[PDB]
């Protein structure tokens, strides 16, 4: 039921400058004019925020250039939009955006927000299809243009809407909406702010903190996300294709969070009025070291410089007696089963790797200790016992067995530590 919408656009996305945006209250603890430093996931100051042009219209006969990509979700995102219309609905978050993995869906319509964690079957170009009544009142909004099926549905939440229009807006002003999403320790936290600005090409120069909206208890693995856009049905064509849906203009700003240290200056009412990001530049590191916004002339010790070391060179001595096992594992005549042999291997250099990987052994079981960690341990004595048995009697050489061999020929204690090795020898020991 879903549509191919994506037209290939040669133009790359632009880049703007997040001057000082995307700061939030990282906790519920009233403060009053206390300069507080906090290490958390924040958007860095003067960073490189990508300006995505979604649906955009050029006038020749009317051409929309749909391009709405799936973006990574590294550690949380900062999302921003100056949209007069209602073209930005919620988002989809997930790992595969397919079946066999759970996904999260946030949808805002005109009176509620609905949030579902479920097992969706999203299409290649998901959107929200809106229908009207010729008096421009709403008729229905089909979510089956987003997904084709939605089963095994775990979480559902519904409340007052996240984003509202507020058109009019005092004449000529624009409404910037900012959101911060982060998914940590099984919780999904959303922060939001709405701010009025005038006709600027970019993000403004001021300062505005972000109050938290919701902390959804999900436990979802998120690595990718995508934005939902609303398209209206055209009614001037019977088909469902890309010519059958009309759209306005949509654009947004996406930046990524990073773990930084921020010095926040609170107000007496409990309002973050300004802040600064430590690191970044030196001056700021001094302000953070002093816990102030004005440093007086002087000289200040601010941190330390420590060269970094690469690679780890492990020196050692050569090797001589690498154990000639090639006497017990390479004998011309073995020993009976009722009088087994007993060699007491002693001080040397044992290389159980030449054994473990020789692939000539039909049975190599290790009991006290898994095989790969033998060439990394040291003991007092190794004993090696040798004998010859039938083929199907090799299962009685193990701790805690019974049978004519383990009963009275050769018994292994019940807390054995070594390993048992066995290989077929039909051509050497059997004679016509």
């Amino acid at each position: 039921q879903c549509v191919n919408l994506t037209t290939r656009t040669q133009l790359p996305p632009a880049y703007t400058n997040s001057f000082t945006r995307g700061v939030y209250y990282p906790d519920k603890v009233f403060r009053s004019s206390v300069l507080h430093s906090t290490q958390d996931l924040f958007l860095p100051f003067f960073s490189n925020v990508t300006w995505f042009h979604a649906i955009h219209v050029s006038g020749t006969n009317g051409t929309k250039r749909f391009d709405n990509p799936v973006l990574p979700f590294n550690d949380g995102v900062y999302f921003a939009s100056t949209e007069k219309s209602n073209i930005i609905r919620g988002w989809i978050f997930g790992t595969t955006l397919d079946s066999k993995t759970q996904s999260l869906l946030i949808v805002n319509n005109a009176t509620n927000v609905v949030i579902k964690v479920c097992e969706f079957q999203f299409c290649n170009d998901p959107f929200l299809g809106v229908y009207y009544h010729k008096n421009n009142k709403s008729w229905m909004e089909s979510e089956f243009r987003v997904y084709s099926s939605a089963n095994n549905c775990t979480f559902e939440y519904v409340s007052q809407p996240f984003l509202m229009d507020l058109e009019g807006k005092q004449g000529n002003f624009k409404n910037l909406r900012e959101f911060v999403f982060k998914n940590i320790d099984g919780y999904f936290k959303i922060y939001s702010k709405h701010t009025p600005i005038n006709l600027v090409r970019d993000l403004p120069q001021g300062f505005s903190a972000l109050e938290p909206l919701v902390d959804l208890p999900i436990g979802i693995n998120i690595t990718r996300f995508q934005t939902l856009l609303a398209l209206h049905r055209s009614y001037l064509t019977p088909g469902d294709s890309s010519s059958g849906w009309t759209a306005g203009a949509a654009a947004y700003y996406v930046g990524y969070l990073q773990p930084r240290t921020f010095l926040l200056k609170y107000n007496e009412n409990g309002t973050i009025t300004d802040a600064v990001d430590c690191a970044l530049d030196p001056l700021s590191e001094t302000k953070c070291t002093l816990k102030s916004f004005t440093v007086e002339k002087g000289i200040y010790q601010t941190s330390n410089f420590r060269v970094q070391p690469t690679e780890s060179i492990v020196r050692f001595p050569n090797i001589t007696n690498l154990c000639p096992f090639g006497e017990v594992f390479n004998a011309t005549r073995f020993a009976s089963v009722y009088a087994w042999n007993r060699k007491r291997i002693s001080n040397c250099v044992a290389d159980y790797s030449v054994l473990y990987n020789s692939a000539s052994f039909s049975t190599f079981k290790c009991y006290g200790v898994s095989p790969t960690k033998l060439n990394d341990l040291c003991f007092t004595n190794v004993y090696a016992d040798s004998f010859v048995i039938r083929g199907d009697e090799v299962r009685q050489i193990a701790p805690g067995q019974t049978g004519k061999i383990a009963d009275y020929n050769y018994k292994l204690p019940d807390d054995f530590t070594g390993c048992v090795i066995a290989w077929n020898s039909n051509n050497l020991d059997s004679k016509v």
Partner: antibody
Framework: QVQLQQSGAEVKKPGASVKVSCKAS????????ISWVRQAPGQGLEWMGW????????NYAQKFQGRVTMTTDTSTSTAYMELRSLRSDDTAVYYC?????????????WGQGTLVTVSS | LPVLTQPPSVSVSPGQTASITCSGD??????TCWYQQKPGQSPVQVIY???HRPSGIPERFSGSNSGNTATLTISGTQAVDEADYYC?????????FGGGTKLTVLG
């Protein structure tokens, strides 16, 4: 280029049931809908109902509610309409039009129509 | 039912403009289509959504819809524009067809 071929000139008795078929060719049948329109001889058009070819999704008029059943078959790409409990007053010409998959308009190509005559 | 009332016959001499009026109640919140059916054939859509005309229909059919009446207008009526003309109104729930209107090029 698009094409809707109907079938039959059936003659029934009062009380029987009739099934009319309409086969499409020239376009993707799975992404549209079929609506049925009646016309009594010498009278105006009547709307019977509509089906979407994606997944069932009928819509009947209240005059024919409980009497008509419309089905599709996208493997052979035909549409069927079955009327039950026929009587005189139902002898007419039945038309098959290609409507959109939603929003219930656009009776564009109009397959040639079958005359169903009841009586005895 | 908002049932559309439409006059049964409109007579026009060859070379004038014909005006067919489909008047029903409300009809301002509904889209109206106009269909043409020649005698002995299947109907042909000539106006779909309130003054919109498909390709292949010549540049003399013009629709209109304002208030409680819809109007089809043919300018320069030839002898080939002699058929029945039906008015149709749809909304989110149902579809209503009007009565006929036999147009005649007074010969």
């Amino acid at each position: 280029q698009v094409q809707l071929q109907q079938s039959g000139a059936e003659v029934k008795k009062p009380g029987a049931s009739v099934k009319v078929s309409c086969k499409a060719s020239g376009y993707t049948f799975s992404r549209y809908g079929i609506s049925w329109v009646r016309q009594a001889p010498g009278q105006g058009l009547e709307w019977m109902g509509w089906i979407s070819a994606y997944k069932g999704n009928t819509n009947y008029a209240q005059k024919f509610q409980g009497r008509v059943t419309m089905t599709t078959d996208t493997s052979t790409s035909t549409a069927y309409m079955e009327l039950r409990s026929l009587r005189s007053d139902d002898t007419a010409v039945y038309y098959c039009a290609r409507s959109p998959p939603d929003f219930l308009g656009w009776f564009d190509p109009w397959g040639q129509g079958t005359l169903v005559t009841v009586s005895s | 039912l908002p049932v559309l009332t439409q006059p049964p016959s409109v007579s026009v001499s060859p070379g004038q403009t014909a005006s067919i009026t489909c008047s029903g109640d409300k009809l301002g919140d509904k889209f109206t289509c106009w269909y043409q059916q020649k005698p002995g054939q299947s109907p042909v859509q000539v106006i779909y959504q309130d003054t919109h005309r498909p390709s292949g229909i010549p540049e003399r059919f013009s629709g209109s819809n304002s208030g409680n009446t819809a109007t089809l207008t043919i300018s320069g009526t030839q002898a080939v524009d002699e058929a029945d003309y039906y008015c149709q109104a749809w909304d989110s729930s149902t579809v209503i067809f009007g009565g006929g209107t036999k147009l005649t090029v007074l010969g």
